[PDB]
Paper text:
[name] M1 GAS SF370 ORF Spy1604 encodes a putative [name] α-mannosidase. We have shown that The [name] ORF spy1604 encodes an α−1,3 mannosidase that is active on disaccharides, some aryl glycosides and can also effectively deglycosylate human N-glycans in vitro. This, coupled to the presence of a gene encoding an N-acetyl glucosaminidase (Spy1600) on the operon (an enzyme known to break β−linked N-acetylglucosaminides) would suggest a role, in vivo, in the utilization of human glycan-derived carbohydrates as a nutrient source.
In addition to the favorable electrostatic interactions discussed previously, the position of F127 is conserved across α-mannosidase II active centers. Additionally, swainsonine is stabilized through stacking interactions of W18 with the five-membered ring, suggesting that the two aromatic residues contribute to positioning mannose into the correct orientation in the −1 subsite. Other conserved active centre residues, D125 and D232 are in equivalent positions to the catalytic nucleophile and general acid/base, respectively, of dGMII. As with the Drosophila enzyme, it is likely that R149 will encourage D125 to be ionized (as required for a nucleophile). The hydrogen-bond from Y192 to D125 may also stabilize the ionized form of D125.
Author numbering:
A (entry chain A): 1 to 515, 521 to 901
B (entry chain B): 3 to 515, 519 to 901
Write the structure that this text describes.
């Protein structure tokens, strides 16, 4: 008799931490799971509960109630708890590429431990969805994803629009990625609360269902209607069975059933039509007014994004590759510790956490977690490096010298001027008064008449090296098999120009021995190497001439300070807000260093800016006035802000490095650095999750009302006209904007606000980011031939050369070694790790281009590869010789 | 003829000179090595795991799949665990904390299936006088410890004059209640047997000394060789070393042993000839430089935080949940265990002492916040659960009921500071601005005055309405979605006396709108109530007259700033250091409030102090110069420091409250507040662990070389001449000193230093405690008749009145109820909780006097008591009617 099937999926959308401290949310999670296990006993008809796609919920429950593991396990075995397949619900754009994979890796592992998994990608609330979601789902064994933002459902009764890229006829779509992967897209057309708090009395039930059924039927491509029975931190509906029974009694034409996503997916498999509308690539709310995309979360609490970048690089690009190589020597690899580090890092990856859009105490807690994960990574990295160095045959170095090993742990050649600190001698305390040992060390340094030099395996001096100084520093060793050993160390501080092949080490040595145009021209205020001529203008901005293309760019590196009367989600400049520019202040130049190899120049600007917003903003936040209606302005009172930017140019390096430093003592404002390119193109390229995504330089004027168009980036953003362009790299600076009049790249360096935003008034004075800041970003001028290299440089430039010391000894390893070969500028390396099951060396690479294929020729000598999925499960598929556009390739290498 | 017990161990400081995770990873290596050596060397007897069960939790957080292996190793005796959870600082943790360490430790040990029957205090900086009672009433007949007892040979005659010298390495330790335990002194430190050699020449050199070192103090033929040290790796070849020792010494029987076997052998052979040590062991008979007592003022913010969480759990969360159980039949055991483990992760000595590096203490702050929020959530729940079940129908429907709780063990008299929600204007589906405008209109229209009423509808005239406002707030219902609203808030102060562990229900209502002499006289500059006349001098110091005894104290409340060129363990005032005094600067008075019930007055002093230490300090720290040799001095450059002290006097309160506020921007200094008493007495009384310990006002002139004598306190310190005295209360201000020439009580408010100290140079810039501070402390003038009341006042004053609102409803509970009776001034209440096994209500009380017995009449209506030990296990013993001197009594109450 019934022609519709109404699926009721009981769920709770459980943001780990948000408007309250984690523990406040945590204790309410205990109540939820408690109510669930109790209801599973009292009401046998209660079908299942969907645990928000995140396995961390189970961990968080057991941390309080570990003795309830068997009851949890049984509930999962019978299907009453529906778990996974992710560990946390991330922000896509603000976590690293690898982090998006490791969320699935760890989630799957947790699911395997429990014995079940929901086969649905879960992005119910994500502030924009990465373009690579289809490939990431498929290659993690998932055929569908559910999401809530950025697609406007148009009626079935209205004719479709082909001009509108981000509209869909039905609540079900076909999502295609840049690599041509396709998945089922499941859109919460009526939000994930459409079936929240179903009534149990007739009159209320009728009013509820008359609306809800019509709202669902309007968008559904099939007879299966999706009713989501929950909301944010919603307690479980304990009388849902009775509510379903009433619904069935009132609407004989509708089959109301307590359901789960797996069953809903299976019913859609039978009845889904062939005319589903297609969505292409990233979904970032392009076709909206642009005021509620929440993209400004990218610049909320930038210090968080910086910490996240620090730890992500540490785990992905230092610790894992080092431990991956050390395995060849130790036959062991720290899986448990790495899992502990990744879990700790990813507790910062739920969207309200990483987005910086929670309360003050939440973000203070994240900082602790960042520190904890980093320390673990850092311990493991130092261990791996010593293990490798200890196995190197270092006997080409005379007894008078102190060997040390440098590592490039990135996937392309690394050319830099390495900044090093080496221990030359150790003066052990033993049983003596430390002051007397200190005096010995001082006396040694005073007797010293020789100069330090660096030598290679063939006894040749590296004349390019520069010794900066010697000093005495307390230090200590912590042996594996005995007590701590304190000592005063003679330390030699030096810089070393070096080019290290991809995934390589080279051993050199420090010794005593006997013992070119500077990059900066002092009379001309000019930095110049083989690639660039950088003139420092009297106002402090830069005129950069590319010495190979010939193109001149004036007025680069402009600092802009604007009011911000918004919140942690959304930036708003006040009415008739005029920018303050640092170049209009007082400018001082300072040479930090200047040689033929490296020059470091400081540009200091002092300019007065408003100290805060005026007294009106406080009244406007307290009353929860929408940010678009606010009449508050910047205060009339001003204070001097001093910006120092250190410019590092290196001799053989096309990438120009900047570090901008200041003490922020001002509230409700935003600081950006600007690079006007004036390049002739209507699009730009941005570093996204496993892709260089093409975006228009103008937002869509049909829909867009926000004067601003902030966008997300990982390591770089770029403009290219077909022959020439500019790549701006960053480190934890995830918000950029393109200013279309001039094609200016604007990088957000600081955003200070005083409140969370969203549903209420939640004061967050710490969101003002008072205190010292230091932001790193770079400029590179590009041609067709260097475009891709500029991309990997911005990526791998985030990772320092690693250094470790060891003595003269026999070893099984060569002094100079490349772990891999066959690198392509167009192929990025993001993972170099080992697999838990059998210790296979897992690599992951992706095509830096969305347009065209390239040759793939990655090779690890002594190893054979086979293709795996993102979760490191072998597939039958054979190793490709080429990457498809936007292909992500994961490989397991086994020692031959 | 001699038996040498080799106990392998590692002294594992959870976090110290490195970040926790750095130590954590090395712990994984320790346990890995142990499990491995259990498999490869069958002769390896056991390993003593530093007396702390947290080690096992920490290991399993990284390697959870190794739980079976751990359990097997524990079952066979190869791992010796517990009996504590952590190794605390005795003095710097709460009284209850010292019990809970054993409670949780026991629970952990019971779960694992074995326990070492030895209290473990290997490195504690001072041992609490109540150690024997605490050990016996926890099922322990012995404690091991390392500090504060000087062993004199059996060759030298035993000196009766020296309280803290022992003839042997074994003592009888006698508590203030006459409890005796076996004291096991590490006479040669817990490293005496570290790194035993495996070669003949080294072994003989080693054992000739070590055996003679032990034989010199051993009362029996049993020699204690502790095979380990701080963070010592396990000695993998110890079996070999023990076999070599046996081949070399036919006269000696070297065995790989454990503490249990060692104690069992001791019980046989111990002579009745052992020295007795009485009370606390704090290194009273040393030079006084290496007591490490100044750990009490290292990073005072930590101690404040610890106090906040300690009061939250002990005196708010548990007392409310214990009562709420009557209604819900449930009590949050798991949540509380989680709260306590989190809190106690901050209780290892190097943690709470603030003698670690900066990152360790940043992590502690997160842990404090986490523990606090769990407790705070549970308290608000319990209060709500109770209030929701009170019969509140006696109040009119146009009124707003609220319940006030006193959760302390005595009568609480204060002026409660309250903020009540009068009306809720819910957001519903409207724009917040419209709803806000409604709330503003209500207040604009409002013509009546707010009043407080009791059950009989009678107005409380002493209540003062301070003001009304609009504030965003929200409710989080148990069974539905969040509910935002704008609340009309009434801010008011309410004088009230609540009996011990009781509640009272009042109500807020509107109604129609004397004869009051204000507490402060603006002409006299005088604060005056029934108890004290407080004259503020022109220099800002205080002249307080006790209106009862007639005694006058001049020049009270002096602020003294001194140099500190020491470290986190030890304070050192530079050579010829001349203190700067706030009264010698610029003084300002500001009235904050002044009524018949309450007066709040602010004394502001602005004075110039040195901004730092001179440049020589840096050199001295770097070279690791001992603090007693440092020639560093305060800098010549000074800055202005502004202290604001808020004095609060209440009409019926004899205790005068102070809150000193300032922004610390100067380094290497100490700030104290002094109370000169000039009382004729040679001893003082300090709040210690379950005791009011008697201490001399003078350090021991025979031994003491340190110009200072800093001591530890919990909630108060007091001077009494036999008829009159002074009690100074504090909140997290755990360091005090008595200045003997004037009998001045000095409370340390700030101690700022730049390094950790101990075995090397570890810079700790955050130990300078830069930023905003707020320190709370109290003054009471006492007589014989009010002495003990001042102690529980200072204890219970740390705990606020709890407030919770509820609507008009029927209910099982009375509107006004006392949960206990039979309170006595001499009897403190420290625990009011429930017991896991059967939800029996657990009370703990102690005698506030070490001298005299007192009547004990504690009674819980509807309940019957039986005596338990500290760990809540029933004994056959019957409920005493008197408390013995310094007795701690734990009771379990069941409903009748
Ligand atoms: O994550 C929370 C919130 C985001 O912070 C902003 C948009 C709405 N979301 C609902 C909550 O789950
Ligand atoms: O706790 C460490 C340290 C203390 O912090 C101070 C002196 C004794 N040391 C032993 C170590 O374990
Ligand atoms: Zn969310
Ligand atoms: Zn220690």
């Amino acid at each position: 008799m019934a022609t519709k099937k109404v699926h009721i999926i009981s769920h709770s959308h459980w943001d780990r931490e948000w408007y309250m401290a984690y523990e406040q949310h945590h204790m309410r999670l205990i109540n939820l799971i408690d109510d669930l296990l109790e209801v599973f006993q009292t009401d046998p008809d209660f079908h299942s509960f969907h645990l928000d796609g995140q396995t961390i919920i189970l961990d968080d429950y057991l941390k309080v109630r570990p003795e309830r593991e068997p009851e949890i396990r049984q509930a999962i075995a019978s299907g009453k708890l529906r778990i996974g397949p992710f560990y946390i619900l991330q922000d896509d754009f603000l976590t690293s590429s690898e982090s998006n994979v490791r969320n699935m890796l760890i989630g799957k592992e947790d699911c395997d431990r429990w014995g079940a998994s929901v086969p649905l990608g879960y992005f119910p609330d994500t502030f924009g969805n990465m373009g690579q979601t289809p490939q990431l789902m498929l290659k993690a064994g998932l055929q569908a994803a559910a999401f809530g933002r950025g697609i406007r459902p148009t009626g079935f009764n209205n004719q479709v629009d082909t001009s509108e890229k981000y509209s869909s006829q039905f609540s079900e779509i076909s999502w295609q990625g840049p690599d041509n992967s396709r998945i089922l897209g499941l859109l919460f057309a009526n939000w994930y609360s459409n079936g929240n708090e179903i009534p149990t009395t007739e009159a209320e039930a009728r009013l509820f269902w008359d609306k809800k059924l019509a709202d669902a039927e309007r968008f559904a491509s099939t007879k299966h209607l999706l009713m989501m029975n929950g909301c944010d931190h919603q307690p479980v509906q304990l009388d849902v069975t009775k509510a379903i029974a009433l619904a069935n009694q009132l609407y004989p034409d509708y089959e109301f059933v307590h359901s789960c996503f797996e069953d809903y997916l299976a019913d859609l498999a039978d009845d889904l039509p062939e005319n589903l509308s297609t969505v292409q690539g990233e979904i970032t709310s392009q076709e909206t007014d642009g005021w509620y995309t929440l993209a400004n979360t990218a610049s909320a609490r930038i210090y968080l994004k910086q910490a996240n970048t620090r730890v992500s690089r540490q785990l992905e690009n230092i610790t894992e590759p080092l431990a991956a190589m050390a395995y060849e020597v130790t036959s062991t690899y720290p899986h448990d510790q790495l899992r502990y580090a990744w879990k700790t890092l990813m507790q910062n990856h739920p969207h309200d956490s990483i987005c910086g859009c929670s309360v003050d105490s939440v973000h203070r807690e994240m900082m602790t977690r960042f520190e904890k994960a980093y320390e673990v990574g850092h311990y493991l990295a130092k261990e791996a490096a010593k293990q490798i160095a200890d196995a190197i045959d270092t006997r080409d170095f005379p007894m008078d010298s102190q060997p040390f090993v440098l590592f490039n742990t990135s996937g392309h050649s690394k050319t830099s001027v390495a900044e090093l600190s080496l221990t030359w001698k150790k003066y052990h305390f033993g049983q003596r008064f430390p002051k007397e040992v200190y005096q010995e060390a001082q006396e040694y340094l005073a007797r010293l008449s020789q100069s330090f030099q660096i030598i290679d395996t063939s006894g040749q001096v590296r004349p390019e090296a520069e010794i900066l100084g010697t000093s005495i520093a307390f230090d200590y060793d912590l042996p594996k098999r005995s007590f701590r050993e304190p000592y005063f160390a003679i330390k030699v501080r030096l810089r070393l120009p070096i080019t290290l092949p991809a995934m390589s080490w080279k051993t050199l040595a420090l010794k005593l021995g006997n013992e070119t145009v500077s990059l900066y021209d002092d009379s001309n205020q000019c930095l110049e190497n083989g690639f660039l001529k950088v003139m420092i203008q009297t106002d402090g901005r830069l005129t950069i001439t590319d010495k190979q293309s010939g193109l001149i760019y004036q007025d680069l590196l402009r600092f802009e300070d604007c009011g911000d009367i918004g919140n942690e989600y959304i930036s708003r400049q006040p009415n008739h807000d005029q920018p303050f520019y640092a170049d209009q202040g007082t400018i001082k130049l300072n040479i930090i260093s200047n040689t033929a190899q490296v020059a470091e120049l400081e540009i200091q600007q002092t300019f007065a800016i408003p100290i805060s917003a005026d007294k009106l903003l406080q009244a406007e936040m307290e009353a929860v006035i929408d940010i678009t209606e606010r009449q508050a302005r910047r205060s009339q009172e001003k204070a001097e802000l001093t910006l120092t930017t250190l410019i590092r140019m290196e001799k053989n390096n096309p990438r120009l490095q900047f570090t901008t430093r200041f003490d922020n003592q001002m509230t409700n404002h935003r600081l950006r650095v600007l690079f006007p390119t004036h390049l002739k193109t209507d699009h730009h390229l941005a570093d996204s999750i496993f892709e260089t995504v093409k975006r228009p330089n103008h937002p869509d004027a049909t829909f867009w009302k926000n004067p601003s168009n902030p966008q997300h980036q990982e390591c770089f953003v770029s403009l290219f006209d077909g022959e020439n362009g500019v790549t701006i790299g960053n480190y934890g600076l995830n918000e950029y904007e393109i200013l279309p009049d001039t094609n200016t790249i604007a990088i957000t360096l600081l955003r200070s606000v005083g409140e969370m935003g969203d549903w209420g008034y939640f004061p967050t004075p710490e969101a003002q980011c008072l205190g010292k800041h230091s932001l790193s970003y770079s400029f590179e001028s590009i041609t067709k031939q260097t475009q891709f290299a500029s991309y990997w440089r911005a990526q791998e430039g985030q990772v320092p050369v690693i250094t470790t010391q060891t003595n003269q000894h026999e070893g099984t390893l060569a002094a100079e070694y490349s772990y891999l070969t066959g690198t392509n500028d167009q192929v990025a390396l993001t993972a170099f790790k080992r697999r838990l099951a059998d210790n296979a060396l897992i690599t992951r690479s992706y095509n830096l281009s969305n347009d065209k294929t390239c040759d793939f020729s990655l090779s690890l000598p002594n190893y054979n590869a086979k293709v795996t999925n993102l979760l490191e499960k072998d597939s039958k598929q054979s190793t490709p010789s080429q990457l498809g556009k936007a292909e992500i390739l994961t490989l397991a290498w086994k020692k031959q």
